[PDB]
PDB file of C-alpha atoms in Angstrom:
ATOM      1  CA  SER A   1     -15.444  -6.407 -21.939  1.00  0.00           C
ATOM      2  CA  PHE A   2     -17.769  -5.660 -19.027  1.00  0.00           C
ATOM      3  CA  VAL A   3     -15.268  -3.094 -17.752  1.00  0.00           C
ATOM      4  CA  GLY A   4     -16.713   0.401 -17.598  1.00  0.00           C
ATOM      5  CA  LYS A   5     -20.274  -0.847 -17.842  1.00  0.00           C
ATOM      6  CA  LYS A   6     -22.771   0.169 -15.189  1.00  0.00           C
ATOM      7  CA  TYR A   7     -25.795  -1.861 -14.126  1.00  0.00           C
ATOM      8  CA  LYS A   8     -28.583  -1.000 -11.676  1.00  0.00           C
ATOM      9  CA  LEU A   9     -30.489  -3.588  -9.607  1.00  0.00           C
ATOM     10  CA  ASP A  10     -33.742  -4.684 -11.332  1.00  0.00           C
ATOM     11  CA  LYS A  11     -34.723  -8.002  -9.679  1.00  0.00           C
ATOM     12  CA  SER A  12     -33.760  -9.669  -6.411  1.00  0.00           C
ATOM     13  CA  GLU A  13     -34.576 -12.927  -4.648  1.00  0.00           C
ATOM     14  CA  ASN A  14     -33.445 -13.977  -1.163  1.00  0.00           C
ATOM     15  CA  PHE A  15     -31.208 -10.975  -0.491  1.00  0.00           C
ATOM     16  CA  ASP A  16     -32.930 -10.430   2.862  1.00  0.00           C
ATOM     17  CA  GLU A  17     -32.184 -14.054   3.734  1.00  0.00           C
ATOM     18  CA  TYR A  18     -28.560 -13.635   2.588  1.00  0.00           C
ATOM     19  CA  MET A  19     -28.052 -10.560   4.716  1.00  0.00           C
ATOM     20  CA  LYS A  20     -29.779 -12.204   7.653  1.00  0.00           C
ATOM     21  CA  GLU A  21     -27.470 -15.241   7.477  1.00  0.00           C
ATOM     22  CA  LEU A  22     -24.475 -12.943   7.094  1.00  0.00           C
ATOM     23  CA  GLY A  23     -25.411 -11.261  10.386  1.00  0.00           C
ATOM     24  CA  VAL A  24     -26.593  -7.827   9.220  1.00  0.00           C
ATOM     25  CA  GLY A  25     -28.800  -6.100  11.818  1.00  0.00           C
ATOM     26  CA  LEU A  26     -32.545  -5.622  11.383  1.00  0.00           C
ATOM     27  CA  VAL A  27     -32.605  -1.970  10.355  1.00  0.00           C
ATOM     28  CA  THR A  28     -29.624  -2.150   7.990  1.00  0.00           C
ATOM     29  CA  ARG A  29     -31.003  -5.269   6.335  1.00  0.00           C
ATOM     30  CA  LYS A  30     -34.474  -3.768   5.792  1.00  0.00           C
ATOM     31  CA  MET A  31     -32.854  -0.551   4.458  1.00  0.00           C
ATOM     32  CA  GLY A  32     -30.700  -2.777   2.279  1.00  0.00           C
ATOM     33  CA  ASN A  33     -33.699  -4.646   0.901  1.00  0.00           C
ATOM     34  CA  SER A  34     -35.198  -1.469  -0.522  1.00  0.00           C
ATOM     35  CA  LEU A  35     -32.158   0.022  -2.255  1.00  0.00           C
ATOM     36  CA  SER A  36     -31.418  -0.288  -5.934  1.00  0.00           C
ATOM     37  CA  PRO A  37     -27.605  -0.070  -6.123  1.00  0.00           C
ATOM     38  CA  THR A  38     -25.448   0.217  -9.161  1.00  0.00           C
ATOM     39  CA  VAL A  39     -22.484  -2.032  -9.943  1.00  0.00           C
ATOM     40  CA  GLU A  40     -19.545  -1.219 -12.181  1.00  0.00           C
ATOM     41  CA  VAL A  41     -16.175  -2.905 -12.607  1.00  0.00           C
ATOM     42  CA  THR A  42     -13.283  -0.759 -13.834  1.00  0.00           C
ATOM     43  CA  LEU A  43      -9.627  -1.504 -14.552  1.00  0.00           C
ATOM     44  CA  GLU A  44      -6.468   0.576 -14.317  1.00  0.00           C
ATOM     45  CA  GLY A  45      -3.268  -1.206 -15.174  1.00  0.00           C
ATOM     46  CA  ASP A  46      -3.053  -4.376 -13.109  1.00  0.00           C
ATOM     47  CA  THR A  47      -5.768  -3.306 -10.605  1.00  0.00           C
ATOM     48  CA  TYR A  48      -9.508  -3.801 -10.842  1.00  0.00           C
ATOM     49  CA  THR A  49     -12.122  -1.869  -8.885  1.00  0.00           C
ATOM     50  CA  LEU A  50     -15.575  -3.294  -8.121  1.00  0.00           C
ATOM     51  CA  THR A  51     -17.792  -0.305  -7.250  1.00  0.00           C
ATOM     52  CA  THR A  52     -21.194  -0.837  -5.688  1.00  0.00           C
ATOM     53  CA  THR A  53     -23.105   2.389  -5.125  1.00  0.00           C
ATOM     54  CA  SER A  54     -26.229   3.119  -3.157  1.00  0.00           C
ATOM     55  CA  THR A  55     -27.728   6.456  -2.195  1.00  0.00           C
ATOM     56  CA  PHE A  56     -26.098   5.953   1.220  1.00  0.00           C
ATOM     57  CA  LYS A  57     -22.628   4.548   0.581  1.00  0.00           C
ATOM     58  CA  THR A  58     -20.147   3.588  -2.149  1.00  0.00           C
ATOM     59  CA  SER A  59     -18.145   0.417  -1.641  1.00  0.00           C
ATOM     60  CA  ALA A  60     -15.235   0.578  -4.100  1.00  0.00           C
ATOM     61  CA  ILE A  61     -12.938  -2.333  -3.603  1.00  0.00           C
ATOM     62  CA  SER A  62      -9.674  -2.569  -5.482  1.00  0.00           C
ATOM     63  CA  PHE A  63      -7.911  -5.856  -6.083  1.00  0.00           C
ATOM     64  CA  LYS A  64      -5.621  -7.799  -8.362  1.00  0.00           C
ATOM     65  CA  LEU A  65      -7.261 -10.901  -9.869  1.00  0.00           C
ATOM     66  CA  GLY A  66      -6.063 -14.091  -8.201  1.00  0.00           C
ATOM     67  CA  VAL A  67      -4.285 -12.303  -5.388  1.00  0.00           C
ATOM     68  CA  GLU A  68      -5.651 -12.953  -1.935  1.00  0.00           C
ATOM     69  CA  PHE A  69      -6.596  -9.841  -0.023  1.00  0.00           C
ATOM     70  CA  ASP A  70      -8.466  -8.824   3.120  1.00  0.00           C
ATOM     71  CA  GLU A  71     -12.008  -7.518   2.623  1.00  0.00           C
ATOM     72  CA  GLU A  72     -14.652  -6.050   5.001  1.00  0.00           C
ATOM     73  CA  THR A  73     -17.969  -7.856   5.153  1.00  0.00           C
ATOM     74  CA  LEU A  74     -21.422  -6.258   5.536  1.00  0.00           C
ATOM     75  CA  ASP A  75     -21.551  -7.422   9.148  1.00  0.00           C
ATOM     76  CA  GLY A  76     -18.195  -5.812   9.831  1.00  0.00           C
ATOM     77  CA  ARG A  77     -15.629  -8.608   9.822  1.00  0.00           C
ATOM     78  CA  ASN A  78     -12.327  -8.571   7.976  1.00  0.00           C
ATOM     79  CA  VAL A  79     -11.834 -11.783   6.007  1.00  0.00           C
ATOM     80  CA  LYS A  80      -9.519 -13.248   3.392  1.00  0.00           C
ATOM     81  CA  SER A  81     -10.982 -12.973  -0.093  1.00  0.00           C
ATOM     82  CA  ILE A  82      -9.920 -13.673  -3.645  1.00  0.00           C
ATOM     83  CA  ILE A  83     -11.452 -12.698  -6.948  1.00  0.00           C
ATOM     84  CA  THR A  84     -10.943 -14.604 -10.191  1.00  0.00           C
ATOM     85  CA  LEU A  85     -12.119 -14.421 -13.788  1.00  0.00           C
ATOM     86  CA  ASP A  86     -13.244 -17.189 -16.118  1.00  0.00           C
ATOM     87  CA  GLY A  87     -14.608 -15.780 -19.355  1.00  0.00           C
ATOM     88  CA  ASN A  88     -17.593 -13.599 -18.485  1.00  0.00           C
ATOM     89  CA  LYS A  89     -17.792 -14.874 -14.879  1.00  0.00           C
ATOM     90  CA  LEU A  90     -16.147 -12.916 -12.120  1.00  0.00           C
ATOM     91  CA  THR A  91     -16.019 -15.036  -8.946  1.00  0.00           C
ATOM     92  CA  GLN A  92     -15.347 -13.890  -5.380  1.00  0.00           C
ATOM     93  CA  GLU A  93     -14.568 -16.436  -2.661  1.00  0.00           C
ATOM     94  CA  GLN A  94     -14.501 -15.400   0.981  1.00  0.00           C
ATOM     95  CA  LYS A  95     -13.048 -17.522   3.780  1.00  0.00           C
ATOM     96  CA  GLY A  96     -13.553 -16.903   7.520  1.00  0.00           C
ATOM     97  CA  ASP A  97     -16.418 -18.165   9.644  1.00  0.00           C
ATOM     98  CA  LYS A  98     -19.220 -17.088   7.316  1.00  0.00           C
ATOM     99  CA  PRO A  99     -17.838 -18.288   3.983  1.00  0.00           C
ATOM    100  CA  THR A 100     -19.460 -16.955   0.826  1.00  0.00           C
ATOM    101  CA  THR A 101     -19.280 -17.229  -2.918  1.00  0.00           C
ATOM    102  CA  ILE A 102     -20.372 -14.359  -5.169  1.00  0.00           C
ATOM    103  CA  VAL A 103     -20.513 -15.020  -8.897  1.00  0.00           C
ATOM    104  CA  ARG A 104     -21.009 -12.077 -11.224  1.00  0.00           C
ATOM    105  CA  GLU A 105     -21.961 -13.087 -14.742  1.00  0.00           C
ATOM    106  CA  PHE A 106     -21.902 -10.336 -17.323  1.00  0.00           C
ATOM    107  CA  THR A 107     -24.177 -11.502 -20.182  1.00  0.00           C
ATOM    108  CA  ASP A 108     -26.782 -10.223 -22.643  1.00  0.00           C
ATOM    109  CA  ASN A 109     -26.012  -6.655 -21.640  1.00  0.00           C
ATOM    110  CA  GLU A 110     -26.932  -7.468 -18.037  1.00  0.00           C
ATOM    111  CA  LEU A 111     -25.307  -8.666 -14.827  1.00  0.00           C
ATOM    112  CA  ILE A 112     -26.500 -11.729 -12.964  1.00  0.00           C
ATOM    113  CA  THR A 113     -25.033 -12.016  -9.469  1.00  0.00           C
ATOM    114  CA  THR A 114     -25.445 -15.270  -7.529  1.00  0.00           C
ATOM    115  CA  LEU A 115     -24.561 -15.142  -3.814  1.00  0.00           C
ATOM    116  CA  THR A 116     -24.142 -18.233  -1.685  1.00  0.00           C
ATOM    117  CA  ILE A 117     -23.956 -18.337   2.145  1.00  0.00           C
ATOM    118  CA  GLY A 118     -24.881 -21.526   4.011  1.00  0.00           C
ATOM    119  CA  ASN A 119     -27.970 -23.025   2.420  1.00  0.00           C
ATOM    120  CA  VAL A 120     -28.983 -19.593   1.094  1.00  0.00           C
ATOM    121  CA  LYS A 121     -28.840 -18.853  -2.623  1.00  0.00           C
ATOM    122  CA  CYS A 122     -29.520 -15.256  -3.595  1.00  0.00           C
ATOM    123  CA  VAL A 123     -29.931 -14.068  -7.204  1.00  0.00           C
ATOM    124  CA  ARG A 124     -29.748 -10.416  -8.143  1.00  0.00           C
ATOM    125  CA  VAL A 125     -30.209  -9.119 -11.644  1.00  0.00           C
ATOM    126  CA  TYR A 126     -28.898  -5.727 -12.666  1.00  0.00           C
ATOM    127  CA  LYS A 127     -29.911  -4.155 -15.976  1.00  0.00           C
ATOM    128  CA  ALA A 128     -27.701  -1.795 -17.959  1.00  0.00           C
ATOM    129  CA  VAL A 129     -28.143   1.858 -17.095  1.00  0.00           C
TER     130      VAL A 129
END
């Protein structure tokens, strides 16, 4: 029910800290802090695509819910990941040596994304385009 809906970043807290903990370099991180990306989840048959788009790059990652897969991280590692759905909450869990949780809650015609890495909690709100 959130499939095909596009949201653009409106509010952000602690993303710089999240990227810093994740190991993103100074320039990329500062560039990343200023962008206002869009997010859209689409579905084709059995396969979902989570597409995050900035003016610089589109990360379009395709996956089957509840099937472990290898995903690239912002700091350039390749780590086991799995994405699951529970109502209106899409959850991504990454293993490896910088484990993260990303919870994407599609409510009230918006998207609330909560990222966890170490003791860092980042909240990013995207409003409907």
